[PDB]
């Protein structure tokens, strides 16, 4: 057919009960993730084509960047808890990968301060139990799909996107194919 298991997507041997409807994993250390977010805008184009009533979830992962990697998962939890993802995503990617000015938890914090999040508000969130469980949620979700690489996207805990089985020609065709594949899996 047009969409085939093993082509644009794969199927989890071990489906995940209760998973988010559309679940994306990434790392601010991940060069392909920088591309996905800053150049290709995958998340954004996927959302734009999702059916009514399907929510998009994006989690950070630990297994890149060592200690700073773990700090970034907690800071992403802070971004989620405060709802400021759209204000820190670009400066975090650029501070880690472009300017390489993010080398510590303090530098991560600077990005939020510069983005207008108050110090008190950031530190209170950072140390909160609500953020601790948001960290564990991200980690649980990653563990549940036996995640070994990013970027990655999963639909309904049953399917994993397989971008390698899409042509890279024109980036835009790749992006819309990705988006369309998610929409198809969504309706499946």
Hey, where are the domains in the chain?
Answer: 1-188
Are 27 and 64 in contact, with CB atoms under 8 Å apart?
Answer: yes
Alpha helices in the chain (DSSP H): 31-34, 42-49, 66-82, 85-97, 105-114, 119-126, 129-144, 171-187
- Distance (Å) of CA 44 to CA 40, 70, 88, 97, 122: 9, 25, 15, 21, 26
CATH superfamily of 1-188: Glutaredoxin (3.40.30.10)
Residue 57 backbone dihedrals phi, psi, to 5 degrees: -120, 135
Q: Kindly give, in sequence order, each residue whose CB lies less than 8 Å from that of residue 124, ignoring residues fewer than 6 positions away.
A: none
Task: Give the other-Cβ count within 10 Å of 84's Cβ.
Answer: 18
Q: Is the dihedral of CA 115, 74, 76, 96 positive or negative?
A: positive
User: How many angstroms separate the most distant Cα atoms in the chain?
Assistant: 55
Burial (Cβ within 10 Å: 0-12, 13-18, ≥19) of residue 96: buried
Find tokens 């489906």 and name the residue: 15
From the list 149, 163, 34, the residue with the least C-alpha distance to 102 is 34
Q: Is the dihedral of CA 75, 73, 21, 178 positive or negative?
A: positive
Q: Return d(Cα 59, Cα 41) in angstroms, integer.
A: 16
From the list 176, 181, 150, the residue with the least C-alpha distance to 22 is 181
Residue 152 DSSP SS3 = strand
From the list 29, 9, 2, the residue with the least C-alpha distance to 152 is 9
DSSP per-residue letters across 39-88: IS-HHHHHHHHSPTT--EEEEE-SSSSHHHHHHHHHHHHHHHHHT-HHHH
Task: Give the other-Cβ count within 10 Å of 77's Cβ.
Answer: 24
Q: Return d(Cα 139, Cα 60) in angstroms, integer.
A: 8
From the list 44, 39, 60, the residue with the least C-alpha distance to 152 is 60
Q: Kindly give, in sequence order, each residue whose CB lies less than 8 Å from that of residue 67, ignoring residues fewer than 6 positions away.
A: none
Q: Return d(Cα 11, Cα 156) in angstroms, integer.
A: 11
């Amino acid at each position: 057919a047009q969409y085939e298991d093993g082509k644009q997507y794969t199927t989890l041997e071990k489906p995940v009960a209760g998973a988010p409807q559309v679940l994306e994993f990434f790392s601010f250390f991940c060069p392909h993730c920088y591309q996905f977010e800053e150049v290709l805008h995958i998340s954004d184009n996927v959302k734009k084509k999702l059916p009514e009533g399907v929510k998009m979830t994006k989690y950070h992962v630990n297994f890149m960047g060592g200690d700073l990697g773990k700090d970034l998962t907690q800071a992403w939890a802070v971004a989620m808890a405060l709802g400021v993802e759209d204000k820190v995503t670009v400066p975090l990617f650029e501070g880690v990968q472009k300017t390489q000015t993010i080398r510590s938890a303090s530098d991560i914090r600077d990005v939020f301060i510069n983005a207008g999040i108050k110090g008190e508000e950031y530190d209170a969130a950072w140390n909160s139990f609500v953020v601790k469980s948001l960290v564990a949620q991200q980690e649980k979700a990653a563990a549940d799909v036996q995640l070994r690489g990013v970027p990655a996207m999963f639909v309904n805990g049953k399917y994993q996107l397989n971008p390698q089985g899409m042509d890279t020609s024109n980036m835009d065709v790749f992006v819309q194919q990705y988006a369309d594949t998610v929409k198809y899996l969504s309706e499946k």
